[PDB]
């Protein structure tokens, strides 16, 4: 679990994000333990340091909350969640959200489900599948108020993966690093074809790290055309921009 120092870092970082993480210290400590346990099994690799996990993953995920987009029982998709980021931190601090965490890798879906159970989270589930396939399902196509994604794909690709999941009026957040100018430059025309438009591009400093970040908001302004998203692998191989 999180050390006293680890808790203090999380707490301080949360404040800089405008959050009171005091009621959530235990949950994050429990999640960190889960990550430790899982990582321990693998012999070639190890979990990154406590401080790096708290700052570059717990707090990084929580930067989503700098955007005023998470009030009420919103239906949210975490696309390509991996080990549950940024989805799990988001769900912990915003319990009202109806969260579906998707990943094409079954073993990661299994971990997230385990974390949900262990943390005793309600209104959150992991789902095994490809974004391109799920976005063709009556259960999921344009059925989300929100979608988020970190470290999945360049904006041109990611926009095709995310936008089809959103109901009109909804919004997705593409979490990005220090530089986005190049990825953004050719984006607008592609967004429009997808029925989206660029919302806020919130530049901020990741607290306690010295590193810049960008939260790229993709608003759903109109229905996505039947063409999108294209079959699995196609957005990646033939990006819209």
In the complex, least distance from residue 201 CB atom to ligand SAM, rounded to whole angstroms? 19
Q: Residue 104, annotated ligand binder?
A: yes
Binding residues for ligand SAM, how many (CB under 6 A)? 16
Q: Nearer to ligand SAM by C-beta: 100 or 169?
A: 100
Task: Give the residue with the Cβ less far from ligand SAM, 67 or 221.
Answer: 67
H helices, E strands: number in the chain: 11, 7
150 is in an annotated binding site: yes
Q: Is residue 135 classed exposed, middle or buried when 0-12, 13-18 and 19+ CB atoms within 10 A define those classes?
A: buried
Which of 91, 140, 150, 214 binds ligand SAM (CB under 6 A)? It is 150
* Upstream peptide bond of 86 is cis (omega within 30 degrees of 0): yes
**Is 90 in contact with 70 (CB distance < 8 Å)?**
yes
| Distance, CA of 204 to CA of 212 (rounded, Å) | 6
111 touching ligand SAM, by CB under 6 A: no
What is d(CA 10, CA 30) in angstroms, rounded to the nearest whole number? Answer: 13
Q: List binding-site positions for S-adenosyl-L-methionine.
A: 80, 85, 103-105, 131-132, 150
Chain contacts with ligand SAM (rule: CB under 6 A): 80-82, 85, 102-105, 108, 130-132, 150-152, 161
């Amino acid at each position: 679990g999180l050390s006293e120092r680890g808790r203090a870092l999380l707490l301080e970082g949360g404040k800089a994000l405008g959050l009171d993480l005091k009621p959530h210290l235990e949950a994050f400590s429990r999640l960190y333990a889960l990550l430790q346990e899982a990582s321990g099994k693998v012999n070639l690799t190890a979990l990154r340091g406590e401080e790096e996990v708290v700052v570059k993953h717990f707090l990084d995920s929580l930067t989503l909350l700098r955007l005023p987009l998470w009030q009420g029982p919103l239906r949210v998709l975490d696309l390509g969640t991996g080990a549950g980021f940024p989805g799990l931190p988001l769900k912990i601090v915003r319990p009202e959200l109806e969260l579906v965490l998707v990943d094409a890798t079954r073993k990661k879906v299994a971990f997230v489900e385990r974390a949900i159970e262990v943390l005793g989270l309600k209104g959150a589930r992991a789902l095994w599948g490809r974004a391109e396939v799920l976005a063709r399902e009556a259960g999921h196509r344009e059925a989300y108020a929100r979608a988020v994604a970190r470290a999945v794909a360049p904006l041109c690709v990611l926009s095709e993966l995310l936008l089809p999941f959103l109901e009109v009026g909804g919004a997705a957040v593409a979490m990005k690093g220090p530089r986005v100018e190049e990825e953004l430059a050719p984006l607008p025309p592609a967004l429009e074809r997808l029925g989206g438009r660029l919302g806020e591009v919130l530049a901020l400093q990741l607290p306690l790290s010295g590193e810049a970040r960008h939260l790229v908001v993709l608003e759903k302004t109109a229905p996505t055309p039947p063409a999108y998203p294209r079959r699995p692998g196609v957005p990646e191989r033939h990006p819209l921009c």
